[PDB]
Every structure is written in structure tokens, then in C-alpha cells.
Design a protein around this ligand. Structure first.
Ligand SMILES: CN(C)c1ccc2cc(/C=C/c3cc[n+](C)cc3)ccc2c1
Ligand SMILES: CN(C)c1ccc2cc(/C=C/c3cc[n+](C)cc3)ccc2c1
Ligand SMILES: CN(C)c1ccc2cc(/C=C/c3cc[n+](C)cc3)ccc2c1
Length: 581
């Protein structure tokens, strides 16, 4: 086992090999053209084939990141295009590789793909392998933290849609509904992975480890604790390597894990038979999306192991993370109706109970009643969903977006405008994704997605920190972000923004831009409105909104759009400044 490059090549095969290397280069250099990365992939691939033939050949024993870093440093346009990135190549390993990772851009400013089915189906028949790569390069360059083995899965189902749609009479009718159903899933998968990496890089291995204990024991209530711990150890390693750019080691270990569980179905879960007959990529995705198993019939009451035992303090101190891991497992298995975001909050609260109770001279009097305290955590969110689902159904998606945009801009005005827009749009979609579900399931849906969206706000905010209120809730804890943001109030410590005419001038292009761009442009001007008038009441904001709708509709219809915006524009500013100031 003397050549890491050869060990990886043999295990995944050339096609997967080229795929993940193109991913790694796409996430490292997101602005570099597609063709330049293919040569890098092709060059490194031939060298790998040389090492499989001869392992004693020069350079075959070097670490993966070295070879990757070596080829990255030869890019003639490294400095002039990525700036300070070009000083990474002055470092040794592993400080050099860490210098690259720190430059992954979560807001790459990349154009928005407008796929046209005619030219797109033409590119597929031209070369089925090249089109496969183009999707890889385009998805990975806008999401540099994507779970790489899943991107290949999405890439195969991509060509699969084309395989069946480019042969129909109405291509457009076949392609566009399938790809949009996919586009939502890949963004949801990118946000999930971005939160997993955020856990380790900002809260430690124990944070991602405890997340796996939650979901696994939830999905696999039959597997005993020793079995769950085994899967957790290897799964956390899989995510640890993927989040660290160790894509080749990540995929290989995901394949090794998917192989282990299928050969151990009887001791894990009974709903994996169908999941364990698909090919490699399909199988692993099936495993992650598998239905949960049935709760055992005669489970001992939770109070037994963690409340009345006169040795809870003893068993805790000897193996804290193991004793706590046992608690999450026992609680996650018996309660699959809880959201993951909820269960770790119960374990984190139980942890805080043990540290302080065992300090007291009579810990037994202190921790025996912890479950009464814990039971009260589940009901605290319960009324937030209702107030949000009622507002939701009343105003609708688009109106609900502007509702939170108004509410949350008043809470954290210092945040930059493109962030408040993007985040407030995603939060409103949680209504369409959760408030139509059954009532007793509306709360698990919300908290799950909220933790994926609030992590985006933090991820976008830690790059350019401008708000202390946001930094506090993002770094205090990983589980209590949703209550920490919901508990924020509009503070009178924020000075309103000075008036900017350019942020309220409109042109005839508003009648041309795509629908998403029309709404984003309108919501961007809305955010700037509150940054200037943070205390404008809801009745006045209602007035301005209708005045702006009538403004846009009027001028998108006249014979001369330019002269209409010319005249009516200033009029709107006057009436708005009068009504609000
Ligand atoms: C796609 N491809 C070329 C291949 C070919 C062969 C592969 C073998 C293994 C494990 C092989 C083994 C190793 C050790 N024992 C005791 C049994 C089996 C894993 C992935 C593979 C991938
Ligand atoms: C465009 N498209 C639908 C298709 C169809 C079939 C494809 C097969 C491969 C081979 C993958 C492999 C090759 C060699 N070993 C040892 C294992 C796996 C790669 C991409 C494909 C793309
Ligand atoms: C406090 N409570 C038990 C609840 C809960 C949910 C409720 C929903 C509605 C529907 C409101 C609507 C009606 C029609 N459109 C088109 C949208 C929304 C009315 C009262 C409610 C009262």
C-alpha cells in the first residue's frame, strides 16, 4: 500500500476517478473554464495509470493533495484571476492545501443557466460523456462544498432524463418538468452538505458525530448501540474527508460503507432489501433516503437508564461522549417523529444537566427530574409554526417572502442586501414545503429546513462579518440557531441608512428581466427601503407596495417605457418619502 494514487484508481475505476477529480478542480477553481480543467483531469489520469503499472515510478508515493496541489500551481492564470490564492503555492503541505480550501467562494457570482431544450438535446447526442462532465463542472463550481459522490449520482440521473426525453416529439414538455424537480433536490442536497461541513470546521468532530447518532438511530431503531457506533465512525470519516477535499478517499469509503451495511441487513434494518440491489451510486443514495424501521415492541422506559440509576454520574464521567451517545441513540430510536434539529437539543440540554447536577453533593435529587425539564423543550416551537402557517396561507409564497424580508431586515439591518434577499426568499419556501403537511408533522419539517437556511446566512455572513447579532447566534451553538434568531428583536441601536436615490431608480429593463429577477429586483429595493426607514409601520409599507405595483404595471404598458419611468419615478419617491417621513 505504497502508492495512494494507485490504490484509489483501482478501487473506483477510471470513469469515477475522472469524475471526482473534475469535481475537486471545479470546487478549487470555480471561475476557470471547463476545457482547462479537462486537460488537468486528463493529465493527472494518465499519471495515475502509470503508477498502477509501475508503483516505484517517481512521484507515485506522494500524498493526494500534493499531486493535486502540484498541478494547481502550474496554472498560468492563478494570480491574475484568483489574487491572493497564488501565495498558497509558496507554502509546503499541508499548510498549502489548507490555504486553497480557505478560498472556496460560497457566492461565486456565476451566471444563471437558462437551459434551452433544443440546443441542450443537441449537445447530449454530440457526446454523451462530455455533456456528463459539463453538468459536473457547472454544479460543482457554484457549490464548492457539495457532497461529491452524490454529484455523480445526480449526474447519471441527469443523462437519464435526456435518454428518455430527447426521443419524444415535444422535448420541452418532457425536459423542463424533470430538471426543475431535480434542481430543487440538488440545492437541498448542497445546503445539507454545507451544514455538515460547517459543523466540523466550526464546532468539531463531536458535533457532526452526534448528528449521525440522531439520524441513524432514528432510521435504524432495531440496530443495537454497538452497531450504530460502528456506522457513525465510518460515516463521520466519509463526511470529514469529503468536506476536506479528500474526494477520492471519501467516495471509496462511502462505497465500503454501503457494502458493509447491505451485508449486515439483518442486524440493521428490514427496509434495505430493495435499496441493496441497485448499482453503486443508486444504492448509496437509496440507503440515505430509506424509510425508517419499526420501533421495537418492549422498549424499556427512557427514565430507567438516565434518571433513576444511582450511578448516572459515574457512568457519565468514565465515558462522557459514549454515555451521551448512548442517550441520543436511546432517544432517537424511540422517537422518529422528532426532527433531528430537536433531538440534539435534548441531548445538549441533558449534557448541561449532568455537568451541574454531578457537581452538587446530592446529584440524585438534581437529575432525577431532568425529563420534566426536557419535555418542555418540545412544546416551545409549537406555536411558531401556526402563526407562520396562518400568515403563509393568507398572503401566499411571494407575499410571504416580502413578509419575512420586512420582519428580518428590522432584526439585523447591518447585513448586506443580497444576503437578506436570498435568505428571506428561502425561508418563505419553507412554508410551501412544510405548512401543507399534516399538523403534527409541520414542526419537524420547519426546524429541519430552517437549520439548513440559517446555516446559509451564517456561511454567507462569516465571509464578511458586519452584524454582531448574527455572529452571536451563529457561533454560540449549532443547535440553538433557530430559537436564537427567532428571539432577536428590532434594536434601536441601529442608525438608519442615508437616502440613496440610485437604490430606488427604475428603468424599462424591469419589464424584460426573468420572473425570478423581477421579484429579486423588487425585493432588493424593499430591503433598502427598511434600511433607510427601519420603523415604518405595516400600514405604510402596505401603501408603498401597492403604489409600486401600480407604478410598474403603468409604465410597462405605455408606448414609451423610458419616458414613463422618467416621469413617474420621481413621483413615487416623493409620495413614499412623504408617507414614511
Ligand atoms: C469497478 N472496479 C474496477 C472494481 C473492481 C474490483 C473491486 C474490488 C473490490 C473489493 C475486492 C475484495 C477485496 C478483498 N477481499 C477479501 C474480497 C474482495 C472493491 C471495488 C472494486 C471495484
Ligand atoms: C452518458 N451515459 C448515460 C453513460 C452511460 C454509460 C456510462 C458508463 C461509464 C463507465 C463506468 C465504468 C467504467 C469502467 N469501470 C471499471 C467501472 C465503471 C461511465 C459513464 C457512462 C455514461
Ligand atoms: C387558530 N386556529 C386553530 C386556526 C388555524 C388555522 C386556520 C386557518 C385558516 C385559513 C385561512 C385561509 C383561508 C383561505 N385561504 C385562501 C388562505 C388561508 C383560518 C383559521 C385558522 C385558525
Amino acid at each position: 500500500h505504497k502508492s495512494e494514487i494507485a490504490h484509489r484508481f483501482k478501487d473506483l475505476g477510471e470513469e469515477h476517478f475522472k469524475g471526482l477529480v473534475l469535481i475537486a478542480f471545479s470546487q478549487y477553481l470555480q471561475q476557470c473554464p471547463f476545457d482547462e480543467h479537462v486537460k488537468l483531469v486528463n493529465e493527472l489520469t494518465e499519471f495515475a495509470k502509470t503508477c498502477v503499472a509501475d508503483e516505484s515510478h517517481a512521484g507515485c508515493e506522494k500524498s493526494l493533495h500534493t499531486l493535486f496541489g502540484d498541478e494547481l500551481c502550474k496554472v498560468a492564470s492563478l494570480r491574475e484571476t484568483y489574487g491572493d490564492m497564488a501565495d498558497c503555492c509558496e507554502k509546503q503541505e499541508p499548510e498549502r492545501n489548507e490555504c486553497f480550501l480557505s478560498h472556496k467562494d460560497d457566492s461565486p457570482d456565476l451566471p444563471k443557466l437558462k437551459p434551452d431544450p433544443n440546443t441542450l438535446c443537441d449537445e447530449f447526442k454530440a457526446d454523451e460523456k462530455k455533456f456528463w462532465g459539463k453538468y459536473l463542472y457547472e454544479i460543482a463550481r457554484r457549490h464548492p462544498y457539495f457532497y461529491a459522490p452524490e454529484l455523480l449520482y445526480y449526474a447519471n440521473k441527469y443523462n437519464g432524463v435526456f435518454q428518455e426525453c430527447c426521443q419524444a416529439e415535444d422535448k420541452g414538455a418532457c425536459l423542463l418538468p424533470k430538471i426543475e424537480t431535480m434542481r430543487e433536490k440538488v440545492l437541498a442536497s448542497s445546503a445539507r452538505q454545507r451544514l455538515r461541513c460547517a459543523s466540523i470546521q466550526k464546532f468539531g468532530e463531536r458535533a457532526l458525530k452526534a448528528w449521525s447518532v440522531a439520524r441513524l438511530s432514528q432510521k435504524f431503531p432495531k440496530a443495537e448501540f454497538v452497531e450504530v457506533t460502528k456506522l457513525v465512525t465510518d460515516l463521520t470519516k466519509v463526511h470529514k474527508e469529503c468536506c476536506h477535499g479528500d474526494l477520492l478517499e471519501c467516495a471509496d469509503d462511502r462505497a465500503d460503507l454501503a457494502k458493509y451495511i447491505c451485508d449486515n441487513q439483518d442486524t440493521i434494518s428490514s427496509k434495505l432489501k430493495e435499496c441493496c440491489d441497485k448499482p453503486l451510486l443508486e444504492k448509496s443514495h437509496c440507503i440515505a433516503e430509506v424509510e425508517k424501521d419499526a420501533i421495537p415492541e418492549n422498549l424499556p422506559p427512557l427514565t430507567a437508564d438516565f434518571a433513576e440509576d444511582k450511578d448516572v454520574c459515574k457512568n457519565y464521567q468514565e465515558a462522557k461522549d459514549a454515555f451521551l451517545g448512548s442517550f441520543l441513540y436511546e432517544y432517537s430510536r424511540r422517537h422518529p417523529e422528532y426532527a433531528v434539529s430537536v433531538l440534539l437539543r435534548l441531548a445538549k440540554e441533558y449534557e448541561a444537566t449532568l455537568e451541574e447536577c454531578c457537581a452538587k453533593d446530592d446529584p440524585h435529587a438534581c437529575y432525577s427530574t431532568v425529563f420534566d425539564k426536557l419535555k418542555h423543550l418540545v412544546d416551545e416551537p409549537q406555536n411558531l409554526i401556526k402563526q407562520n402557517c396562518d400568515q403563509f396561507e393568507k398572503l401566499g409564497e411571494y407575499g410571504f417572502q416580502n413578509a419575512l424580508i420586512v420582519r428580518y431586515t428590522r432584526k439585523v439591518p447591518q447585513v448586506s442586501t443580497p444576503t437578506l434577499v436570498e435568505v428571506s426568499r428561502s425561508l418563505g419556501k419553507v412554508g410551501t414545503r412544510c405548512c401543507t403537511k399534516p399538523e403534527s408533522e409541520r414542526m419537524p419539517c420547519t426546524e429541519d429546513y430552517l437549520s439548513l437556511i440559517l446555516n446559509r446566512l451564517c456561511v454567507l455572513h462569516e465571509k464578511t462579518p458586519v452584524s454582531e447579532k448574527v455572529t452571536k447566534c451563529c457561533t454560540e451553538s449549532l443547535v440553538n440557531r433557530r430559537p436564537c434568531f427567532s428571539a432577536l428583536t428590532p434594536d434601536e441601536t441601529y442608525v438608519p441608512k442615508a437616502f440613496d436615490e440610485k437604490l430606488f431608480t427604475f428603468h424599462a429593463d424591469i419589464c424584460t428581466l426573468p420572473d425570478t429577477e423581477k421579484q429579486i429586483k423588487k425585493q432588493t429595493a424593499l430591503v433598502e427601503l427598511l434600511k433607510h426607514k427601519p420603523k415604518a409601520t405595516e400600514e405604510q409599507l402596505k401603501t408603498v407596495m401597492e403604489n409600486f405595483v401600480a407604478f410598474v404595471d403603468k409604465c410597462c404598458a405605455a408606448d414609451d417605457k423610458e419616458a414613463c419611468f422618467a416621469v413617474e419615478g420621481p413621483k413615487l419617491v416623493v409620495s413614499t418619502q412623504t408617507a414614511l417621513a
